[PDB]
Ligand binder design. Structure first.
Ligand SMILES: Cc1cn([C@H]2C[C@H](O)[C@@H](COP(=O)(O)OP(=O)(O)O[C@H]3O[C@H](C)C(=O)[C@H](O)[C@H]3O)O2)c(=O)[nH]c1=O
Ligand SMILES: Cc1cn([C@H]2C[C@H](O)[C@@H](COP(=O)(O)OP(=O)(O)O[C@H]3O[C@H](C)C(=O)[C@H](O)[C@H]3O)O2)c(=O)[nH]c1=O
Ligand SMILES: C[C@H](O)COCC(COC[C@H](C)O)(COC[C@H](C)O)COC[C@@H](C)O
Lengths: 138, 138
């Protein structure tokens, strides 16, 4: 079963004026926000990701529409659909992830614990498996 | 001229897989991201904002759809439409703002330089005008 992943619940401050959700570094999520990014205008048949990370922590949030996140570690896979702006998906080190079924108008926001650093990525699936079997298997 | 406001241009990494914009604290924007929040599901006839701040810096970004920002300082008003995820509207201290014409499903993301602090807000437009006059007029 799926280590290094959680669903985080944010305040959804909602009235006749609309919805607002705040996320304060170290309060609403466990790390300081050094970097954000967001993904938009993804075509319906596209899959993104295909990677893990050595040390990075992130929280993914779908702020409009819906998107599916495939989460993999050795011998376990989960799909999580993100479709509620008040819910974040925390993904820590050594989880492999893929994102797909981006709806029209979909907005995927990620909060990240470190500046962009390509050396922290694991893009090679066989190296990922070797590393992750060390961590997760006994 | 509209003091204390800028449009910042962010990287837009676009190809057949879609668009991604990264924003790194202190690099792509001048301050550290202590807090984000986002506004969604606002009805077409609503106006939000009606405030300013004493010391907060923020960057506003429309990640889907469109929204208009009314910016006011004494003796000046401008309206800016945000409809590009790759462009941030930096608003500094002692600028009054209102947001209206949220399209559906508009997403408005805000990056903020400080944790949420109600004592920093100026929500009374008379008090605003009073402090602002002292700043902006001769
Ligand atoms: C995140 C990021 C990416 N990039 C560049 C690197 C590539 O040239 C391009 C696309 O990167 P990538 O193929 O890694 O994008 P996704 O496949 O959507 O993966 C992203 O979203 C999933 C959820 C992840 O966990 C990754 O860490 C994150 O990169 O953007 C940057 O220049 N700065 C950045 O901060
Ligand atoms: C921003 C924020 C708000 N809230 C609470 C406080 C209020 O009870 C409620 C809505 O606040 P407000 O009426 O100020 O929301 P907007 O009129 O959309 O204004 C917001 O967006 C414009 C652009 C601004 O510049 C404000 O700083 C920002 O608050 O959410 C929190 O609890 N934490 C937060 O970080
Ligand atoms: C429902 C109405 O259409 C909105 O009225 C907005 C307001 C502020 O405009 C002042 C500035 C010149 O723009 C008009 O009030 C007159 C003043 C305050 O005495 C006050 O609203 C404050 C709420 C949003 O907290």
């Amino acid at each position: 079963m799926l280590y290094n992943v959680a669903l985080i619940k944010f305040k959804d401050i909602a009235d006749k004026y609309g919805h607002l959700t705040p996320i304060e570094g170290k309060i609403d999520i466990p790390f300081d926000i050094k970097r954000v990014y967001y993904i938009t205008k993804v075509d319906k048949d596209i899959t993104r990701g295909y990677n893990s990370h050595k040390k990075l922590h992130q929280v993914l949030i779908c702020l409009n529409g819906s998107v599916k996140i495939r989460l993999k570690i050795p011998d376990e896979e989960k799909i999580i659909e993100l479709n509620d702006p008040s819910v974040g998906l925390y993904i820590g080190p050594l989880v492999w992830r893929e994102m797909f079924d981006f709806t029209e108008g979909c907005v995927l926001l990620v909060l990240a614990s470190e500046y962009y650093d390509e050396t922290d990525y694991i893009r090679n699936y066989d190296f990922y498996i070797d590393e992750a079997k060390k961590r997760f298997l006994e």
